[PDB]
Amino acid sequence: LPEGLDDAYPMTSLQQGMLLQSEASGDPRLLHNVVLHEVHGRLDGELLARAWAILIGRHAILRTGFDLHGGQVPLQWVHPATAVAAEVPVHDLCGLDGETRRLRLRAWIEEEQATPFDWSRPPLVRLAALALDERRFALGVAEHHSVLDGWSLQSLVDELLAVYADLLAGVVAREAEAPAVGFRDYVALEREAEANAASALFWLDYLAGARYRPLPGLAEEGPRRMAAVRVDVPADSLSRLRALAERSGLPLRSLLLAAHGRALCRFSDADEVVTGFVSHGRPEEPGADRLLGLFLNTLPCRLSASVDLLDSARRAFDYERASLEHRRHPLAAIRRRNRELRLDSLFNFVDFHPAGVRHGGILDQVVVDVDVPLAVDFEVAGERLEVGFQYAAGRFPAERAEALAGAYREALLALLGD
Ligand code: NA
Ligand code: NA
Ligand code: NA
Ligand code: NA
Ligand code: NA
Ligand code: NA
Numbered sequence: 001l002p003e004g005l006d007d008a009y010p011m012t013s014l015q016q017g018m019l020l021q022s023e024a025s026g027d028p029r030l031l032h033n034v035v036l037h038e039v040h041g042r043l044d045g046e047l048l049a050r051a052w053a054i055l056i057g058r059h060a061i062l063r064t065g066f067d068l069h070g071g072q073v074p075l076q077w078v079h080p081a082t083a084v085a086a087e088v089p090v091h092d093l094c095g096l097d098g099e100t101r102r103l104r105l106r107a108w109i110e111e112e113q114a115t116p117f118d119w120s121r122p123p124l125v126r127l128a129a130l131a132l133d134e135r136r137f138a139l140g141v142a143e144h145h146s147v148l149d150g151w152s153l154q155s156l157v158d159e160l161l162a163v164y165a166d167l168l169a170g171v172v173a174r175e176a177e178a179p180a181v182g183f184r185d186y187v188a189l190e191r192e193a194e195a196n197a198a199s200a201l202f203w204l205d206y207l208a209g210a211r212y213r214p215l216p217g218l219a220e221e222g223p224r225r226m227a228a229v230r231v232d233v234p235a236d237s238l239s240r241l242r243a244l245a246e247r248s249g250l251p252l253r254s255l256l257l258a259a260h261g262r263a264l265c266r267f268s269d270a271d272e273v274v275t276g277f278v279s280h281g282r283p284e285e286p287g288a289d290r291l292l293g294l295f296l297n298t299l300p301c302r303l304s305a306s307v308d309l310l311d312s313a314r315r316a317f318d319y320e321r322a323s324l325e326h327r328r329h330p331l332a333a334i335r336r337r338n339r340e341l342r343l344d345s346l347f348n349f350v351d352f353h354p355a356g357v358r359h360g361g362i363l364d365q366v367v368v369d370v371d372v373p374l375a376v377d378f379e380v381a382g383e384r385l386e387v388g389f390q391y392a393a394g395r396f397p398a399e400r401a402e403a404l405a406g407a408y409r410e411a412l413l414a415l416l417g418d
Contacts (some may be wrong), residue, residue: 001071007078009184011066013194013330014294016074018146019066019119021371027224028116029369031145034109036130036138037157038360043137044168045090048129051164053086054173055156056123059292060183061147066119076187077120084122091130093138105130105138105364112142113366125156138363145294145368149280152292154352157359165357179287186283186295193281193328202326203334207274207300207341215344216268217400218373218392226367227393229401230386231408238385240416250313253349254320256378256387258312259411260347261303267407270305276346276372277301277319281328298331299323300341309414345374353380376408387412 001008011019022030056062063084065077093104108130117124124147128140141157148156163173193199214220234240245252257277264273276298282288301319306312335341367390374396376389387408391401 001075001077004080004083005077006063006080007060007184008075009078009187010191011068011074011076012187012190012294013332014296015066015076015146016068017332018144019068019074022144022146023068027369029113030224031368031370032113032117032142033145033153033366033368034113034140034142035153035365036105036109036140036363038132038363039137039139039161039357040135040360041137041165041357042135042168043090043129043131045088045129047167048127048164049086049088051160051167051173052088052127053081054163055160056084056086057081058159058175059156061152061293062123062125064124064147065122066124066146068119076183079122086123088127088129091128094131094133101132102364108140109364109366112140117144127160136360145370147294148292149294149296150350151280151289151352152294155290156292161357161359168357176290177287179285179290181283181285181288181291183291183293185285186281186291186293189281189283190297190328190330193326194330194333196326196329199326199329200333200337202323203300203329204337206302206323207334207338210274210300210302210341211272212274212340212342213268213270214342215373215396216270217397218344219395222392222395224369224371225392225394226369226390227398227401228367228388228390229405230388231405231412233385233387234409234412234416234418237412237416238380238383241385244415248310248313250310250317252380253351253378254313254317255415256349257301257303257316257320257347258309259408259415260376260378261312261316262305262309262411262414263404263407264303264345265305266410267404272302272304273345274341274343275301275303276331276343277323278346278348279323279327297328298343298346299327300331300334300343301347309411343372345376346372348375348377350377350379374404 060078063079067075125143130138166173280295282295373392379386
């Protein structure tokens with residue numbers, strides 16, 4: 001361990017598994033997120049790199065290198081800000097026609113997706129700025145999933161643009177109140193949970209008797225190719241479902257998780273499916289919502305078929321309540337004691353809720369190469385419920401994916417009752 005570090009502490013089980021999965025693959029594209037954001041505003045490359053330096057100084061994960069094999073346990077090395085370079089390459093797309101610009105944006109994505117990371121050289125997030133016209137640039141943001149979850153990514157982008165807008169307006173960059181906890185505290189919470197016997201036993205008992213029938217239509221083997229599908233969500237679903245939620249005393253997440261289960265049981269013609277429920281284990285401490293890092297753990301979730309979809313919602317709520325205190329027991333540890341466990345699908349509920357510089361939307365992005373066959377996102381975006389999924393097109397025929405999307409639409413309709 002070199003001198004000078006701010007800190008060092010173990011990698012999490014998800015950090016380790018993802019990096020081991022990347023190392024086993026040889027492909028830089030695996031678990032490699034890449035997104036282009038539209039930014040309204042003058043592009044000043046030096047001010048943008050200054051803004052990034054400010055963020056780098058505020059967040060340990062952006063000064064962190066991973067050391068998988070060097071010591072006896074995989075370690076996170078937190079380097080001092082003085083040792084971490086803040087680079088934002090500027091590219092010039094000004095003056096191009098529309099289709100050329102779109103193609104050049106796509107090319108930046110694909111090139112970055114094919115560019116590997118040096119796990120010992122922070123930051124493990126890369127930025128670029130692509131000038132589009134005098135009032136508009138694209139901000140490229142790219143990281144391995146081992147570094148940031150989606151909530152952290154959103155917080156990162158929002159804080160970069162706030163700091164940048166401060167510098168562009170000539171004021172001092174403002175900072176939020178220091179959180180109580182840091183990422184190191186989450187690490188400790190997970191290691192305790194991994195060692196917690198009642199939590200290990202809870203997950204063993206919960207899966208006793210479960211069966212793992214493959215997703216029907218999903219080939220055992222195939223190449224790695226990713227595709228995405230939007231579900232045709234009924235007209236006013238969010239408003240109608242929030243009202244069902246308040247009246248019935250069931251949260252919205254529970255209603256949607258029951259819908260997920262109904263879709264999957266119908267599509268698979270199965271009495272029960274075992275899906276992965278993506279939960280976050282951020283410490284329950286002030287400011288934990290402002291931390292940057294990877295806080296996700298995927299939990300086994302058993303969803304049984306029922307004609308009474310509201311009773312399925314109640315059971316999904318009871319599942320979340322019973323599993324809550326056990327939610328930081330890592331999936332890999334559950335798998336170590338249950339080798340039969342296999343999750344072909346994931347459920348992800350996403351709920352991340354001015355003049356001058358403003359974020360204008362997403363111009364382009366990758367469908368991230370992952371190994372999980374089917375990942376379903378339920379997203380509260382604005383006043384809209386957005387549902388979609390990504391799947392292994394190399395293993396899952398597109399005709400089945402469109403059938404599955406119909407099942408999700410049918411499930412949402414069954415919730416509303418039209
Ligand atoms: Na997320
Ligand atoms: Na994002
Ligand atoms: Na559909
Ligand atoms: Na179906
Ligand atoms: Na893509
Ligand atoms: Na809606």
